Design a protein around this ligand. Structure first.
Ligand SMILES: [Mg+2]
Ligand SMILES: [Mg+2]
Ligand SMILES: [Mg+2]
Ligand SMILES: [Mg+2]
Ligand SMILES: [Mg+2]
Ligand SMILES: [Mg+2]
Ligand SMILES: [Mg+2]
Ligand SMILES: [Mg+2]
Ligand SMILES: [Mg+2]
Ligand SMILES: [Mg+2]
Ligand SMILES: [Mg+2]
Ligand SMILES: [Mg+2]
Ligand SMILES: [Mg+2]
Ligand SMILES: [Mg+2]
Ligand SMILES: [Mg+2]
Ligand SMILES: [Mg+2]
Ligand SMILES: [Mg+2]
Ligand SMILES: [Mg+2]
Ligand SMILES: [Mg+2]
Ligand SMILES: [Mg+2]
Ligand SMILES: [Mg+2]
Ligand SMILES: [Mg+2]
Ligand SMILES: [Mg+2]
Ligand SMILES: [Mg+2]
Ligand SMILES: [Mg+2]
Ligand SMILES: [Mg+2]
Ligand SMILES: [Mg+2]
Ligand SMILES: [Mg+2]
Ligand SMILES: [Mg+2]
Ligand SMILES: [Mg+2]
Ligand SMILES: [Mg+2]
Ligand SMILES: [Mg+2]
Ligand SMILES: [Mg+2]
Ligand SMILES: [Mg+2]
Ligand SMILES: [Mg+2]
Ligand SMILES: [Mg+2]
Ligand SMILES: [Mg+2]
Ligand SMILES: [Mg+2]
Ligand SMILES: [Mg+2]
Ligand SMILES: [Mg+2]
Ligand SMILES: [Mg+2]
Ligand SMILES: [Mg+2]
Ligand SMILES: [Mg+2]
Ligand SMILES: [Mg+2]
Ligand SMILES: [Mg+2]
Ligand SMILES: [Mg+2]
Ligand SMILES: [Mg+2]
Ligand SMILES: [Mg+2]
Ligand SMILES: [Mg+2]
Ligand SMILES: [Mg+2]
Ligand SMILES: [Mg+2]
Ligand SMILES: [Mg+2]
Ligand SMILES: [Mg+2]
Ligand SMILES: [Mg+2]
Ligand SMILES: [Mg+2]
Ligand SMILES: [Mg+2]
Ligand SMILES: [Mg+2]
Ligand SMILES: [Mg+2]
Ligand SMILES: [Mg+2]
Ligand SMILES: [Mg+2]
Ligand SMILES: [Mg+2]
Ligand SMILES: [Mg+2]
Ligand SMILES: [Mg+2]
Ligand SMILES: [Mg+2]
Ligand SMILES: [Mg+2]
Ligand SMILES: [Mg+2]
Ligand SMILES: [Mg+2]
Ligand SMILES: [Mg+2]
Ligand SMILES: [Mg+2]
Ligand SMILES: [Mg+2]
Ligand SMILES: [Mg+2]
Ligand SMILES: [Mg+2]
Ligand SMILES: [Mg+2]
Ligand SMILES: [Mg+2]
Ligand SMILES: [Mg+2]
Ligand SMILES: [Mg+2]
Ligand SMILES: [Mg+2]
Ligand SMILES: [Mg+2]
Ligand SMILES: [Mg+2]
Ligand SMILES: [Zn+2]
Lengths: 204, 140, 174, 16, 37
RNA sequence: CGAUGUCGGCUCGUCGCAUCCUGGGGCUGAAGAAGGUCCCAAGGGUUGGGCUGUUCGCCCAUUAAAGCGGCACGCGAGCUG
RNA sequence: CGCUGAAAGCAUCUAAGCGGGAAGCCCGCCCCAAGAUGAGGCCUCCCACGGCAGCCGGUAAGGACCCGGGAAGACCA
């Protein structure tokens, strides 16, 4: 179960066998192994990774001493891939090759305080026939005296997006090792320049 | 004269090998021990009892077909969040909770009550980490 | 009119030593073990093994014949063995042996391969007679039921996999 | 479903 | 299988048994097969 | 009765199962296909129209199916009227 | 629906035991989560500061205020 840290860069389409395949491009590589989680000391099995070189100025003291014990220069992000122990001490895009199949995890685009129609695909009220100031309003939220209360988890308006989202079974279309590029046919969570994670798929 | 109430006493650590004992009958004596009613100077409003260390709570035993028919339950607060898991499945995954749940419902409700629950330390398996207090082993 | 008392003929050389709740039975064709109720008593006589019951209430009466016929079948297993035959009926139907496995061609679209567990060994004389052999009576009896189940004897035609000596009862069709 | 139609117990509220 | 609160023997080959705490009527004639409920 | 706003619709659902469909079964006057009927099962699904305020009902065209009920005949400090 | 099997010399899926068997239950998938007060774990950083399990200060590593902002956002974060 292999993973890699990366940044979403932007979408395009290419042509493969006279078919148009819309891809998103992810600057994945390279990710230096900064720490290894072993059952003896930690309990599970995982690898702490690193992304984006950082100003050794910007990196504070306790962080600095951490990076150093591993031999890594300061890097902007630490994230762990679970159940992963690569042979080397640095991960590149070349742990995927075209035809594979990935799960991609990012932070979705935040829609802030979203209405009930945007957030929950509700249908609001009529826009004529006497409908009165309720065109985007949810409707009834409960019953009457029995139960006399509102179900926990009731779909109401509130913040939507800027949450973790994982998309599954995405075809690895091509890998550009030199420029550390990973191609993936489909839609990846989040904005361009957003941090993402690319693991091997859970599906089969 | 007024009834004697005691100054804060040093509590006693106590060990039980819960193996092969009946669930509710051991559960009832662990409650008495936690409440410290075995003590001549019992005072109702303070934790004065014992610390009860238990091992092999997984090897507890129970009569009837209760293994397949004793159903513990949890309510999440959400629609449909009543979950029902029988005894055997509990022992398979979280066996200390069986005896733990039993002692609990035989303890009082209120502050002191659930503070007495904290003075119980149930362990599955043959061993316990509490060698430091050196708990006196009781055959109950 | 009672089986718990009828003593168990033990041929030579069968080794029927006794343990608390176990009765080990080593024979010429292998060994088996018998879980015996701890309330019953197994006894070893000269070439005979006998079982006594501790009381005459229902459960001790029920356990009795059982923990006899159980120890019985284990003596007849390790010595002369247990078999069970399966006849196959149906025009296209046939079964063959692929090394130590059994491949049935019983009119599906695939063919079905059965894997004989530890103890069971398959054997196919004709292309329409399968034989299950093993020292365990219950285990032989499972495998045979297992295999037969794949294509149970139909109702309307003489098609399916049949138990040895299975009555061929059918029902009219039109 | 109540087969026999049920008459209102209250008037439609009017200003008093 | 017929399910009913009146399990009865139907023919002379019908047999009444109790398996898994329930009354049955097994028989070679498959119609005669019964359970109580 | 010093007020517990009352049909139907919209919206949001949630539960029961005496199950419409989907799943698993026994019996069949079950050849196959397809039905009948009883048992298990509430996980999910259960369309769009014409008429009438209508719930209901008929009808059109589909459907895997076009389930029945509880929630103050759920839901007027949410809307309609 | 069975295997083996007595009570009950036969039979019996069961009384001892072992199978097979649902979109259903438990895992498994995605998401939240140690306020899980039972408050967990690991990696790294500071470290014995001055005075009459407490107080008063100056500091350490750090943090915060303030500012430029941001597919983050009502304010807060
Ligand atoms: Mg763009
Ligand atoms: Mg190409
Ligand atoms: Mg992320
Ligand atoms: Mg965002
Ligand atoms: Mg926004
Ligand atoms: Mg949106
Ligand atoms: Mg939406
Ligand atoms: Mg929409
Ligand atoms: Mg709408
Ligand atoms: Mg609209
Ligand atoms: Mg609409
Ligand atoms: Mg108006
Ligand atoms: Mg308006
Ligand atoms: Mg309004
Ligand atoms: Mg509303
Ligand atoms: Mg209430
Ligand atoms: Mg937010
Ligand atoms: Mg999501
Ligand atoms: Mg695909
Ligand atoms: Mg006390
Ligand atoms: Mg006490
Ligand atoms: Mg009370
Ligand atoms: Mg007024
Ligand atoms: Mg039936
Ligand atoms: Mg009748
Ligand atoms: Mg019979
Ligand atoms: Mg009134
Ligand atoms: Mg009033
Ligand atoms: Mg009033
Ligand atoms: Mg009022
Ligand atoms: Mg009405
Ligand atoms: Mg039912
Ligand atoms: Mg079906
Ligand atoms: Mg059905
Ligand atoms: Mg016909
Ligand atoms: Mg048919
Ligand atoms: Mg049927
Ligand atoms: Mg359902
Ligand atoms: Mg319609
Ligand atoms: Mg018209
Ligand atoms: Mg209409
Ligand atoms: Mg109408
Ligand atoms: Mg009508
Ligand atoms: Mg159909
Ligand atoms: Mg139809
Ligand atoms: Mg209803
Ligand atoms: Mg409803
Ligand atoms: Mg009512
Ligand atoms: Mg009402
Ligand atoms: Mg109403
Ligand atoms: Mg309301
Ligand atoms: Mg209303
Ligand atoms: Mg109103
Ligand atoms: Mg209304
Ligand atoms: Mg109201
Ligand atoms: Mg009101
Ligand atoms: Mg009007
Ligand atoms: Mg008007
Ligand atoms: Mg039979
Ligand atoms: Mg027999
Ligand atoms: Mg039999
Ligand atoms: Mg049994
Ligand atoms: Mg089983
Ligand atoms: Mg079988
Ligand atoms: Mg199974
Ligand atoms: Mg499926
Ligand atoms: Mg998380
Ligand atoms: Mg914490
Ligand atoms: Mg946490
Ligand atoms: Mg708690
Ligand atoms: Mg506390
Ligand atoms: Mg604590
Ligand atoms: Mg602690
Ligand atoms: Mg912590
Ligand atoms: Mg831990
Ligand atoms: Mg802000
Ligand atoms: Mg701002
Ligand atoms: Mg402000
Ligand atoms: Mg501020
Ligand atoms: Zn009959």
């Amino acid at each position: 179960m292999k993973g890699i840290l990366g940044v979403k860069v932007g979408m395009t389409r290419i042509f493969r066998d006279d078919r148009a395949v819309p891809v998103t491009v992810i600057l994945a590589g390279p990710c230096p192994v900064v720490q290894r989680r072993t059952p003896e000391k930690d309990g599970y099995t995982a690898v702490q990774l690193g992304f984006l070189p950082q100003n050794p100025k910007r990196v504070n003291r306790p962080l600095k001493g951490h990076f150093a014990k591993a031999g890594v220069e300061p890097v902007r992000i630490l994230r762990e891939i679970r159940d992963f122990n690569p042979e080397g001490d640095t991960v590149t895009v070349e742990i995927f090759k075209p035809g594979e199949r990935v799960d991609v995890t990012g932070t979705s685009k935040g829609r802030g305080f979203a209405g009930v129609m945007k957030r929950w695909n509700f249908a609001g009220g009529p826009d004529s026939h006497g409908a009165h100031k309720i065109h985007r309003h949810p409707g009834s939220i409960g019953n009457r005296k029995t139960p006399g209360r509102v179900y926990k988890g009731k779909k109401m308006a509130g913040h939507y997006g800027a949450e973790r989202v994982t998309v599954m079974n995405l075809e690895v279309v091509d890998v550009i090792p030199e420029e550390n590029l990973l191609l993936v046919k489909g839609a990846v969570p989040g904005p361009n320049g957003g941090l993402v994670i690319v693991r091997e798929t859970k599906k089969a | 004269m007024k009834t004697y109430v005691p100054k804060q006493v040093e509590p006693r650590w106590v060990l039980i090998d819960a193996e092969g004992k009946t669930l509710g009958r051991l559960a009832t004596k662990i409650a008495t021990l936690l409440r410290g009613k075995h003590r001549p100077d019992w005072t109702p409003n303070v934790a004065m009892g014992d610390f009860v260390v238990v091992v092999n709570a997984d090897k507890i035993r129970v009569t009837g077909k209760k293994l397949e028919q004793k159903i513990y339950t949890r309510y999440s607060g959400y629609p449909g969040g009543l979950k029902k898991i029988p005894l055997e499945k509990m022992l398979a995954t979280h066996p200390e909770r069986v005896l733990e749940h039993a002692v609990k419902g035989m303890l009082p409700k209120g502050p002191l009550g659930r503070r007495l629950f904290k003075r119980l330390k149930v362990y599955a398996g043959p061993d316990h980490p509490h060698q430091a207090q050196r708990p006196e082993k009781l055959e109950v | 009119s009672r089986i718990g008392r009828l003593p168990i003929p033990v041929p030579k050389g069968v080794s029927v030593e006794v343990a608390p709740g176990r009765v080990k039975v080593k024979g010429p064709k292998g060994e088996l073990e018998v879980p015996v109720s701890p309330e019953m008593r197994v006894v070893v006589e000269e070439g005979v093994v006998r079982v006594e019951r501790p009381s005459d209430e229902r459960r001790h009466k029920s356990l009795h014949g059982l923990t006899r016929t159980l120890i019985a079948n284990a003596v007849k297993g390790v010595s002369e063995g247990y078999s069970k035959e399966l006849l196959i009926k149906g025009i296209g139907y046939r079964a063959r042996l692929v090394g130590r496995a059994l491949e049935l061609t019983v009119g599906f679209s695939h063919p079905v391969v059965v894997e004989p567990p530890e103890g069971i060994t398959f054997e196919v004389p004709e292309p329409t007679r399968v034989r299950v052999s093993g020292i365990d009576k219950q285990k032989v009896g499972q495998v045979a039921a297992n295999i037969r189940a794949i294509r149970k004897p139909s109702a309307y035609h003489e098609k399916g996999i049949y138990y040895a000596g299975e009555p061929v009862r059918l029902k009219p069709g039109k | 479903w109540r087969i026999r139609p049920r008459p209102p117990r209250l008037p439609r509220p009017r200003p008093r | 299988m017929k399910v009913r609160a009146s399990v009865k023997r139907i023919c002379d080959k019908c047999k009444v048994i109790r398996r898994h705490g329930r009354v049955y009527v097994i028989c070679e004639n498959p119609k005669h097969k019964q359970r109580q409920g």
